[PDB]
């Protein structure tokens, strides 16, 4: 309910609405191969 989880610490860390998600970042390689019900934010 709190947005895009961006890591773990058990306790899941959530995106800070002030700056996350960064418009300047994304997937790193062209071989994403993403079809398995992924979670995306912007």
């Amino acid at each position: 309910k709190e947005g895009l989880q961006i890591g773990k610490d058990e306790k899941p860390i959530y995106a800070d609405k002030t700056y996350q998600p960064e418009p300047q970042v994304g997937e790193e390689s062209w071989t994403d191969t993403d079809g398995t019900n992924e979670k995306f934010g912007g």
Binding site: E28, S29, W30, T31, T33
Partner: protein, 48 residues
């Protein structure tokens, strides 16, 4: 190596692509890799 399509159930098995696999003295004499995910080699992630 020979390849066929997607259905190719029992008898409709006729090759459509024939690839001549080989081994070469591959080398990169004037360039370096700037992005490589995994330290190991020959993985789907290493295609990119």
């Amino acid at each position: 190596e020979f390849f066929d399509g997607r259905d190719a159930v029992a008898g409709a098995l006729a090759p459509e692509i024939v690839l001549y696999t080989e081994n070469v003295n591959l080398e990169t004499p004037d360039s370096h890799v700037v992005y490589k995910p995994e330290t190991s080699n020959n993985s789907h992630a290493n295609l990119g």
